[PDB]
Design a protein around this ligand. Structure first.
Ligand SMILES: C#CCOc1cnc(C(=O)Nc2cc(F)c(F)c([C@@]3(C)N=C(N)S[C@@]4(COC)C[C@H]43)c2)cn1
Length: 380
């Protein structure tokens, strides 16, 4: 799968995008890779932030579905016109498929001013597709219409704004992207990429919460979220433990709440006063788990557009959630992540490109013995 290595680009905090073509003749667009949604949606009008946009009038293969879709998020929104067209991934498999495309015709706080992407590729399942689960997601079309295997994998490599990169391997796994073994956790249900966290440690120290709290109301793997988001109760306990572990220096309450940055002189960041965070995930076998471990390099993130400071400033990128745990870029940048849809499981291995120091490294380890893991899942 050497053709697909290094097919992702981006800037810090603006997501990871892949090049795609839409229509005949092909119109090239940069598309955000998003495991946390299920619509393929592209700018179709000259919004001032966009480098380019889908021009349906130039495509002979365009077909109108004569139906609109309105998609509000918690803080942004877009509205679009549904159709189908021929879609390819130049640095992906040598195939072309007819996919649903939402042509975005109105938006608010969706596109990023200064970003280099013009659309989103929702790689999750039909259950959370808008307007409903009858709108077949891109990856489902790809698999149905071709011989590409029903899996993909992601290596997200973290860094005026630093450039990020990585690989999306479509239909396979590239062993050059990881070291050690892959460890798999079940996809609990095919909507989001829902997983179950069974234990949490800060520097080896169990938080000791009822594990249901770790997954209330769900835990997902989401390449379209920057942070590690945690349920409120879990965030409260997690911060309490991280504060204690890093108490040799003090920081204001707002830093922990993500309401202000913290800065240090160039090259003087105290990585070592910050603890590692380990998430144990449900394993493949009854009573068996494995653990993934990330560093402060992952959850303490450089902000490189602070014009009013000359120092190295960082954002605390663990945050409280009302929608459950979100394993965003903070988690994924440590690991090679295999979305093994064929076997309803997600694989983690140490990423060959993860950012670390001479003392500590990201880890994937098992097996561990963990009882009552089925009790960790939330039901209504
Ligand atoms: C680089 C880097 C660090 O990682 C990321 C990942 N994603 C982003 C990002 O901008 N994601 C993004 C932006 C949106 F405007 C946006 F609407 C979304 C959506 C479609 N997808 C998500 N997974 S979060 C979301 C609500 O959940 C559906 C806001 C929706 C993601 C930025 N940095």
């Amino acid at each position: 799968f050497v053709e697909m290595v290094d097919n992702l680009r981006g800037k810090s905090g603006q997501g990871y995008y892949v090049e795609m073509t839409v229509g005949s003749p092909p119109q090239t667009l940069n598309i955000l890779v998003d495991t946390g949604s299920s619509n393929f949606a592209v700018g179709a009008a000259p919004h001032p932030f966009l480098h380019r946009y889908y021009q349906r009038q130039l495509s002979s293969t365009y077909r109108d579905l004569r139906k609109g879709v309105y998609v509000p998020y918690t803080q942004g929104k877009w509205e679009g016109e549904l159709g189908t067209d021929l879609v390819s991934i130049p640095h992906g498999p040598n195939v072309t498929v007819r996919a649903n495309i939402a042509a975005i015709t109105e938006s608010d706080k969706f596109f990023i001013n200064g970003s280099n992407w013009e659309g989103i590729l929702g790689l999750a399942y039909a259950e959370i597709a808008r307007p409903d689960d009858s709108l077949e997601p891109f990856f489902d079309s790809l698999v149905k219409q071709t011989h590409v295997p029903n899996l993909f994998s992601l290596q997200l490599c973290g860094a005026v704004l630093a450039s990020v990169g990585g690989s999306m391997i479509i239909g396979g796994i590239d062993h050059s992207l990881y070291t050690g073994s892959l460890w798999y956790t079940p996809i609990r249900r095919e909507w989001y990429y829902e997983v179950i966290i069974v234990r949490v440690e800060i520097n080896g120290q169990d938080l000791k919460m009822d594990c249901k709290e770790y997954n209330y109301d769900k835990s997902i793997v989401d390449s379209g979220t920057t942070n590690l988001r945690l349920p409120k109760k879990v965030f409260e306990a997690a911060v309490k433990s991280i504060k204690a572990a890093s108490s040799t220096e003090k920081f204001p309450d707002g830093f922990w709440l993500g309401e202000q940055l913290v800065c240090w002189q160039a090259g003087t960041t105290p990585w070592n006063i910050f603890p590692v965070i380990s998430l144990y995930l449900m394993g493949e076998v009854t009573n068996q788990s494995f653990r993934i471990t990330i560093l402060p390099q992952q959850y303490l993130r450089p902000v490189e557009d602070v014009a009013t400071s000359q120092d190295d400033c960082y954002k605390f990128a663990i945050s409280q959630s009302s929608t459950g745990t979100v394993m965003g870029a903070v988690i994924m940048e440590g690991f090679y992540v295999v979305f093994d849809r064929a076997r309803k499981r997600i694989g983690f291995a140490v990423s060959a490109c993860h950012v670390h120091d001479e003392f500590r490294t990201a880890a994937v380890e098992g097996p561990f013995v963990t009882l009552d893991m089925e009790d960790c899942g939330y039901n209504i």
